[PDB]
Design a protein around this ligand. Structure first.
Ligand code: 8ZI
Ligand code: 8ZI
Lengths: 306, 306
C-alpha cells in the first residue's frame, strides 16, 4: 500500500547522456546508436538568443566545432544536421549502451520521467505531465537543456521530451525528439506566455481511484451525475471536459473498485464545490492531476521493466 | 527554476538488484561484490510469519535452498549467514556492476531514494524521509521486500534502507544494510503501532527557503522570534524542537537568501497558527517536510553524480 509520485528507473537513459559544447555554450545531448540529439540553440551566444537565425548561425559551424564528451572520453563528430529545433550530430561510435527505444510525441495529460542532467551528468529523476497548455512543471537550472523525458514499456524506452526553455511562472517548454515544440513555443528569448493551466480531469479521477484502493474513502458521496452535468462544473473550475473515451480509459479502475466512473465524477463535483474542509487524500490537500489511469494501475499492480 | 521531489538516478543500484527464492517465498536481494543481502523472512512460510524463530527455521536451510537470479542467470550460493534481520548469501561471482558503496544508518529527518523492485526487476524510483517515528511513507506491494533506499555522493552509493514490512495506516518499516530495524519494529506479523508522526521542522524551513529562491514569498512576514518561543508553538503542532545545530545547518540557505533563520521561524509560526488561507507554496497546500537543507541546496545549485 501507499501511493507516491514514482519515476521510471533511469539507468537505461543515464548511459545515453553526453555533454555537447559549441563555442562558449555547454548543454546535454542524447547518444543513441551513432547520433547525438541536442537543442539547436547550442550554436547560440547570449546575444543570438534574442533573435536567432539558426540556418545562418549554423553556416559558421563545422563538424569539429561540436565537442561531444561521453564521461571522460571525446566522440568524433563526422556529420551534423538541423531537424526542426534539434541538431543531430553523427558520431563515428555507436553508443554500446543504446537501449531498445522509440521517439513518441505524447498527448497533453500524459506523464513521463525527467532525468535532469548538467554537463552530461545525471542530477536527479522525477515524474512530469504534459499540461493541457503544453508546458511542464519541472526543476531545471541553466545547463539542464537537452535533459530528456521518457517512458519505459518493459525493455523499450519511448523518448517524448527534450528540455529547451523556461517561461514566466517557472514552467518549462521543449520538443519531441524530432525537434517539434510541444505547444506554440519557439526557441527565442522573446515574450511568450502560457495559456490557461487547465486541470487534467481524467487524471484527477484516476488518483481518486488510487485513494479508494489505499482505503482513503471519506470523499465517496451518496450522489451520481451525467457527463453533461459534470462538464458544466468542470468548465467553471478550468477542468478539461470529460469524454466517453476518458470514461472507457477509467474502466480497469472502475471495475477493480466497483465504483462507476459517473459516481466518482459526482464525488469530484462535491470536492470542487465544497473543497476538502482541511482534510487530505493520499497526503495531499489539493486534487492531484499528474497521475494517468495507467500510472495508477502500474503502481497499484507492480508492473516492472527489463 | 521550479522545485520537485527528485530521486537520485537509479542506474548504479538497478545493476545490483537480484531475485531471491527460498521455498515458496520470492523477494529482492542486493548483490554487492560476492554477497547478496536480503530480508531474513525469505525463509518463512505465511504460517511462520505469525511467530517465527529465525535461528530454528534457518537450520532447515542449506546453500542450495536459496535460488538467486540476476536477470535470466542463476548465481551459485556457496555460503549463508544471518546478521540481525538480514541474510547474507555468499555467491561464487562478484557482481561486475558493483559501484563504489557504503552502508550508512541514517538519522531521522534524513531523506533517501527508494528503487521499488518486484522479482528482482526495478518498477520505479521515489524520494522518502526517515520519519521521527522511524517509519517511511513509501509505495510497496507484496514482492517489494528487499527493495533498498540509498543516497549518491558523486561516485559513491550509501545504502541506508532495506524494505521489510508495512504497518497500519500504510507506512513502512525496514532495516539498515546490517539488518538492524529503524525504530522499535520486529519482523513478525504481530500488533505493532507507529508512535506520533512528528513534522521535521528543519526540513519545513529548508523548503520555505526553496520557495523564496523560486519567488514564492507571500508568507514572508514582518516578525521574528526566539528558538524558545518558536519551540512552544512547534510542541503544540507536533513539530520537532528546533536546535542551534539545526540553525547552523540552515546557514547556507539563510546566507543565500539574506533571511535570518529566526525570521523564517516567525513566518513558519504564522503559517502554523493561521494556515495557508487556501494559498499554495511550491504548488503545495500543506507544509512539506521531506526536503533536507542539503536536498534544497543540491536541487537549487545542480549538484551531479558520476
Ligand atoms: C538551456 O539553454 C540550458 N543551457 O540549460 C536553458 C534552460 C533554462 C535556464 C533557466 N531554466 C531553464 O530551463 N534555456 C534557455 O536559456 C532558453 C534559450 C534562450 C532563452 N531561454 C530561456 O529559457 C529563457 N526564457 C525565455 O526566453 C522565454 C521568456 C522570455 C518568455 C521567459 C530564460 C529567460 C533564460 C528562462 C532560448 C533559445 C529559448
Ligand atoms: C515483503 O515480505 C514482501 N514479500 O514484499 C512484505 C511487504 C509488504 C506487503 C504489503 N506491503 C508491504 O510492504 N512484508 C511482509 O509481508 C511482512 C513480513 C511479515 C508480515 N509483514 C507485513 O508487512 C505485515 N505487517 C505486519 O505484520 C505488521 C502489522 C500487523 C502491525 C500491520 C502485513 C500485514 C503483510 C502488511 C513480516 C515478517 C513482518
Amino acid at each position: 500500500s501507499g501511493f507516491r509520485k514514482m519515476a521510471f528507473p533511469s539507468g537505461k537513459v543515464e548511459g545515453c547522456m553526453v555533454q555537447v559544447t559549441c563555442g562558449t555554450t555547454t548543454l546535454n545531448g542524447l547518444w543513441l546508436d551513432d547520433v547525438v540529439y541536442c537543442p539547436r540553440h547550442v550554436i547560440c551566444t547570449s546575444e543570438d538568443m534574442l533573435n536567432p537565425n539558426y540556418e545562418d548561425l549554423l553556416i559558421r559551424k563545422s563538424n569539429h566545432n561540436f565537442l561531444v564528451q561521453a564521461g571522460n572520453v571525446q566522440l568524433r563528430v563526422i556529420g551534423h544536421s538541423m531537424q526542426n529545433c534539434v541538431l543531430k550530430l553523427k558520431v563515428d561510435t555507436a553508443n554500446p549502451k543504446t537501449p531498445k527505444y522509440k521517439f513518441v510525441r505524447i498527448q497533453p495529460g500524459q506523464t513521463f520521467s525527467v532525468l535532469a542532467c548538467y554537463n552530461g551528468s545525471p542530477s536527479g529523476v522525477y515524474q512530469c505531465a504534459m499540461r493541457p497548455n503544453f508546458t511542464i512543471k519541472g526543476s531545471f537550472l541553466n545547463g539542464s537543456c537537452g535533459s530528456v523525458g521518457f517512458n519505459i514499456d518493459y525493455d523499450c524506452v519511448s523518448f517524448c521530451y527534450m528540455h529547451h526553455m523556461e517561461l514566466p511562472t517557472g514552467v518549462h517548454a521543449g520538443t519531441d525528439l524530432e525537434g517539434n515544440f510541444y505547444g506554440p513555443f519557439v526557441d527565442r528569448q522573446t515574450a511568450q506566455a502560457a495559456g490557461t493551466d487547465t486541470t487534467i480531469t481524467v487524471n484527477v479521477l484516476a488518483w481518486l481511484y488510487a485513494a479508494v484502493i489505499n482505503g482513503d474513502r471519506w470523499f465517496l458521496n451518496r450522489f451520481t451525475t451525467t457527463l453533461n452535468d459534470f462538464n458544466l462544473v468542470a468548465m467553471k473550475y478550468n477542468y478539461e471536459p470529460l469524454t466517453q473515451d476518458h470514461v472507457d480509459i477509467l474502466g480497469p479502475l472502475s471495475a477493480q473498485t466497483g465504483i462507476a466512473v459517473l459516481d466518482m465524477c459526482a464525488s469530484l463535483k462535491e470536492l470542487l464545490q465544497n473543497g476538502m474542509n482541511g482534510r487530505t487524500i493520499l497526503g495531499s490537500a489539493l486534487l492531484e492531476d499528474e497521475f494517468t489511469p495507467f500510472d495508477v494501475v502500474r503502481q497499484c499492480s507492480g508492473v516492472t521493466f527489463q
